């Protein structure tokens, strides 16, 4: 299933910085209001809840920058071609968050519920309304879709 | 994906009472320690998180007894052939519970962490450790499997 990753508090979406159809490794992932094919994602299941968040246009996947098993708070989110266990995430569509295998979540940098376009995303352990994400249809940004298959 | 519905606190599983391959309509669902093909389930997705919990051997699904949209506390869980919105559940594999469309959960009747074999299951709104369920492989009762597949 193809979906948009929507920041629940702002309604902005996860994008590669610059919107490239083939972002370079380590391109940052930001929040931006626009919708287009280069901000479509899919989820590739690896092990029950755990899988890779794949940028459809490039085939690169979401990583914490540096690929640590336990990235510290404020580690930037990026795209990278590599597949390994430090690029594993769970798409928690019940609590509305995205959890890295090490236990921390994807956040807007600085914690704003209404961050401006091109706000970077980072790893952080905290849970609050401004780290919530929902996973929605490219054809209807208010309709949740099932990311697991 | 075929799975066992495992009561987390006790390790017992959801069964039709009597363990038939073809339980009659309105047969109660109970907890029981045995594993066999007549306690296998599948989940048929209807709308994103919402779907039918299907008894594989019979093709009947889990209902609140009487088919309420908002079943009261202590309403019995049963199997029934019918498919409708009052037999929709969500299999919350992050919080480890099974939520009915009306917002309440599947519980062992009385809320014991170690209910005896053949304890009835019911709807109840409370959340606690004795209403948690995990969804496991028929080949490995300790291995969680993805039910949304
Ligand atoms: N035109 C795009 C815009 O839609 C968005 O993807 C943005 C993300 O940084 O990059 C470009 O400016
Ligand atoms: N070794 C890793 C690489 O695989 C990737 O996770 C990358 C993501 O930034 O970080 C490191 O360079
Ligand atoms: N308090 C918030 C924290 O929860 C997290 O959102 C962080 C993300 O950078 O920003 C702030 O420190
Ligand atoms: N033999 C079965 C047992 O395995 C279990 O399914 C039980 C559930 O009530 O019914 C019968 O006793
Ligand atoms: N008419 C309903 C039937 O569809 C089913 O939900 C059943 C479940 O017990 O309750 C009622 O008979
Ligand atoms: N106190 C418990 C309640 O939380 C619920 O588990 C209920 C289920 O029947 O049993 C007991 O009343």
Swiss-Prot record, chains A, B:
Free-text activity regulation comment from the record: Bacterial binding activity is inhibited by D-galactose. Hemagglutinating activity is independent of divalent cations Ca2(+) or Mg2(+). It is strongly inhibited by N-acetyl-D-galactosamine (GalNAc), D-galactose and D-talose, and to a lesser extent by melibiose and raffinose. Also inhibited by glycoprotein asialo-bovine submaxillary mucin (BSM). Not inhibited by D-glucose, D-fucose, D-galactitol, N-acetyl-D-glucosamine or lactose. Fungal binding activity is inhibited by D-galactose.
Result after altering residue 66 to A: Loss of hemagglutinating and porcine stomach mucin-binding activities
The keyword Glycoprotein belongs to this UniProt entry's keyword annotation: yes
Effect of residue 107 to A: Retains slight hemagglutinating activity and has 6-fold decreased porcine stomach mucin-binding activity
Residues binding D-galactose 1, per UniProt: 15, 18, 34-36, 118
Tissue note: Highly expressed in mantle and to a lesser extent in muscle, hepatopancreas, gill and hemocytes.
Binding site for D-galactose 2: 26, 63, 66, 82-84
Superkingdom of origin: Eukaryota
Consequence recorded when altering residue 63 to A: Loss of hemagglutinating and porcine stomach mucin-binding activities
Keywords: Glycoprotein, Hemagglutinin, Lectin
Result for mutant: residue 15 to A: Loss of hemagglutinating and porcine stomach mucin-binding activities
Function: Galactose-binding lectin. Binds both alpha and beta anomer of galactose (Gal), but has a stronger interaction with the glycans having alpha Gal at the non-reducing end and binds beta Gal weakly only in highly branched glycans. Has high affinity to Galalpha1-4Galbeta1-4GlcNAc. Binds N-acetyl-2-deoxy-2-amino-galactose (2-deoxy-GalNAc). Binds N-acetylgalactosamine (GalNAc). Binds porcine stomach mucin (PSM) with high affinity. Binds galactosamine. Binds laminin, bovine submaxillary mucin (BSM), fibronectin, type I collagen and gelatin with a decreasing affinity, respectively.
Official protein name in the record: Galactose-binding lectin
Organism expressing this protein natively: Crenomytilus grayanus (Gray mussel)
């Amino acid at each position: 299933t193809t979906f948009l990753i929507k920041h629940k508090a702002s309604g902005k979406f996860l994008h590669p910085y610059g919107g490239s159809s083939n972002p370079a490794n380590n391109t940052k992932l930001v929040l931006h209001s626009d919708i287009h094919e280069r901000m479509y994602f899919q989820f590739d299941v690896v092990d029950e809840r755990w899988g890779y968040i794949k940028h459809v246009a490039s085939g690169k996947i979401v990583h914490p920058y540096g690929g640590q098993a336990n990235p510290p708070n404020e580690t930037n989110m990026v795209l990278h071609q590599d597949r390994h266990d430090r690029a594993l995430f769970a798409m928690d569509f019940f609590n509305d968050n995205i959890m890295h295998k090490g236990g921390k979540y994807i956040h807007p940098k600085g914690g704003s519920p209404n961050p401006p376009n091109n706000t970077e995303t980072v790893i952080h352990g905290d849970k609050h309304a401004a780290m919530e994400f929902i996973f929605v249809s490219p054809k209807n940004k208010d309709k949740r879709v099932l990311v697991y298959a």
